[PDB]
C-alpha cells in the first residue's frame, strides 16, 4: 500500500466496517487516526498498527498538512461536521473521502466542491454501494436490457433507531443530522433508484409521518414515503423508517422481467435475483482503493461531491414536497459525470 489514509472519527462505522475494510485494500493503508479521544485512538492505533505519533484531534487536525505520507483523510463524523473538516482537509492539501450524506446543506455541498477544486484535490463521497459487486451486477444486467424497459422501482430502507435517551444520538438532532431516516438511510433507496434506472427524477412527491408521542422523532422524521417520475416515464415509490427492523429491499420492474435485491445495500453479502414470466472486491475495500487509484491516475472518482450534492438537493426537494404536499420539480439538468 502506498496511499495513506487519515481516518477522522473512530465511531461505529469506522471501527466496525472501515478500519477492518483496509485488510483487503491493495493500495490504501491506515496512516493516521483522528478523534476527540486519545485513549480510544491509542488502543485503536495499536490495534491496527499505526504509530501513536500520528494520533491527532479536532484542534491540531490541520497539523496533517505537514505529513506527506498522509495522502487523504476520511471523514466519518456526524453530518453537520462534514463540510467543516472537508474544507480544512483540502486546506492541508489532501484528497477527501467524505461519508454520506455529503452535508446537511446544499450550500455546504457546493462549498466543499469549491474547496476541492481550489486545493486541486479530489472529493469522493462514501457510496460503498457504487463499489459493491452485487449492485454493480444488478446495474450491468439492467443496462444489458434483461429487464426490458424499466417502469416501476420500489425501495425500502429501515432499521430501529435506539431509544436510549435520544438526546444522546446525533442522528436525532436536526442540527447534527440534517434530517431523519431519509438523510440517514432512505438516501440508499433514492441513490439506488437513480443508478439502477440510470437517470434522474424530474418530478418528486412525498409524505412523512412520525408518532407525535415518540421522543425520538421530535426533530428528525421517523418514516417518510417518496414517489418520483423520470424522463423515460419510469416511476418509483420508496420509503425509509426509523421504527421498524432491518430492511434493505429494492425491486426494479421491466416489461421483460423483474429484478429483486434483498438485501440490497447491506454490509455483508447482498442478494439479487431476476424473475421473468464477490471476487476480491468487497465494497469497503474497493471503495478505499478506488480513491487511491483515482489519484494514482489523475482519473475522476466514480462518486464525486457533485453526486453527493445531487442527492442532498433531491433530499431537500423531497422534504419540501412532504412539507407542502405538492409535487416538486427537480428537473434541473444534473448530469452523472462518468455514468451510474
115 and 91 Cβ atoms separated by less than 8 Å = yes
The catalytically annotated residue of 56, 74, 127, 188 is 188
Per DSSP, the residues of 74-116 read EE-S-TTHHHHHHHHHHHTT-EEEEPSSS-SSHHHHHHHHHHH
Q: Rule CB under 8 A: is residue 231 a binding residue for a second copy?
A: no
> Contact positions toward ligand NAD, by CB under 6 A?
9-14, 35-36, 76-79, 81, 99-100, 126, 128, 170, 176, 184
Interface pattern 136-175 for a second copy (x via CB under 8 A): ------------xxxxx-x-x-x-x---------------
> Which partner in a second copy, ligand NAD, none is near 256 (CB below 5 to 8 A by kind)?
a second copy
Whole-angstrom distance, CA of residue 270 vs CA of residue 249 = 10
205 binds a second copy (CB under 8 A): yes
SS3 state of residue 321: helix
Q: Is 188 a catalytic residue?
A: yes
Interface with a second copy, residue 333, by CB under 8 A: no
Element containing residue 135 per DSSP (H, E)? helix 133-143
Q: CB-wise, 144 or 268, nearer to ligand NAD?
A: 268
Instruction: Report the alpha-carbon distance of residue 209 to residue 215 in Å, rounded.
Output: 14
Please say which residue, 54 or 205, places its beta carbon nearer to a second copy. Answer: 205
Binding residue (CB under 8 A) for a second copy from 91, 111, 237, 336: 237
Is 100 part of the annotated catalytic residue set?
yes
Handedness of CA 25, 31, 34, 39 (dihedral sign): positive
Place of cell 487536525: 61
Give 213's contacts (C-beta < 8 A, 6+ positions apart): none
As annotated, the active-site residues are 100, 188
Site for a second copy, rule CB under 8 A: 148-152, 154, 156, 158, 160, 205, 207, 209, 211, 223, 225, 227, 229, 233, 235, 237-239, 241, 243-247, 249, 251, 253-258, 260, 262, 275-277, 325-327
Amino acid at each position: 500500500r502506498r496511499f495513506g489514509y487519515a481516518i477522522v472519527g473512530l465511531g461505529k462505522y469506522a471501527l466496525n466496517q472501515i478500519l477492518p475494510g483496509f485488510a483487503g485494500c491493495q493500495h490504501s493503508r491506515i496512516e493516521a487516526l483522528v478523534d476527540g479521544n486519545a485513549e480510544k485512538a491509542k488502543i485503536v492505533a495499536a490495534e491496527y498498527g499505526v504509530d501513536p505519533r500520528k494520533i491527532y484531534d479536532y484542534s491540531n487536525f490541520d497539523k496533517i498538512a505537514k505529513d506527506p505520507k498522509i495522502d487523504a483523510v476520511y471523514i466519518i463524523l456526524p453530518n453537520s461536521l462534514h463540510a467543516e473538516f472537508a474544507i480544512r482537509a483540502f486546506k492541508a492539501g489532501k484528497h477527501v473521502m467524505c461519508e454520506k450524506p455529503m452535508a446537511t446543506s446544499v450550500a455546504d455541498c457546493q462549498r466543499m466542491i469549491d474547496a476541492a477544486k481550489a486545493a486541486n484535490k479530489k472529493l469522493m463521497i462514501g457510496y460503498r454501494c457504487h463499489y459493491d459487486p452485487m449492485n454493480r451486477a444488478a446495474v450491468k444486467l439492467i443496462r444489458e436490457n434483461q429487464l426490458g424497459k424499466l417502469g416501476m422501482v420500489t425501495t425500502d430502507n429501515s432499521d430501529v433507531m435506539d431509544q436510549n435517551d435520544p438526546a444522546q444520538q446525533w442522528r436525532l438532532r436536526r442540527e447534527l443530522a440534517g434530517g431523519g431516516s431519509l438523510m440517514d438511510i432512505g438516501i440508499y433507496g433514492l441513490n439506488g433508484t437513480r443508478y439502477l434506472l440510470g437517470e434522474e427524477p424530474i418530478e418528486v412527491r412525498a409524505y412523512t409521518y412520525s408518532d407525535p408521542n415518540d421522543e425520538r422523532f421530535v426533530e428528525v422524521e421517523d418514516r417518510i414515503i417518496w414517489q418520483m417520475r423520470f424522463r423515460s416515464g419510469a416511476l418509483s415509490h420508496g420509503a425509509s423508517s426509523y421504527s421498524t427492523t432491518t430492511t434493505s429491499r429494492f425491486s426494479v420492474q421491466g416489461d421483460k422481467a423483474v429484478l429483486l435485491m434483498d438485501p440490497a445495500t447491506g454490509y455483508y453479502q447482498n442478494l439479487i435475483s431476476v424473475q421473468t414470466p464477490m471476487p476480491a472486491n468487497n465494497q469497503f475495500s474497493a471503495q478505499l482503493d478506488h480513491l487511491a487509484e483515482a489519484v494514482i491516475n489523475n482519473k475522476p472518482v466514480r462518486s464525486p461531491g457533485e453526486e453527493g450534492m445531487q442527492d442532498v438537493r433531491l433530499i431537500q426537494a423531497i422534504y419540501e414536497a412532504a412539507r407542502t404536499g405538492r409535487p416538486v420539480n427537480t428537473d434541473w439538468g444534473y448530469v452523472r459525470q462518468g455514468g451510474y
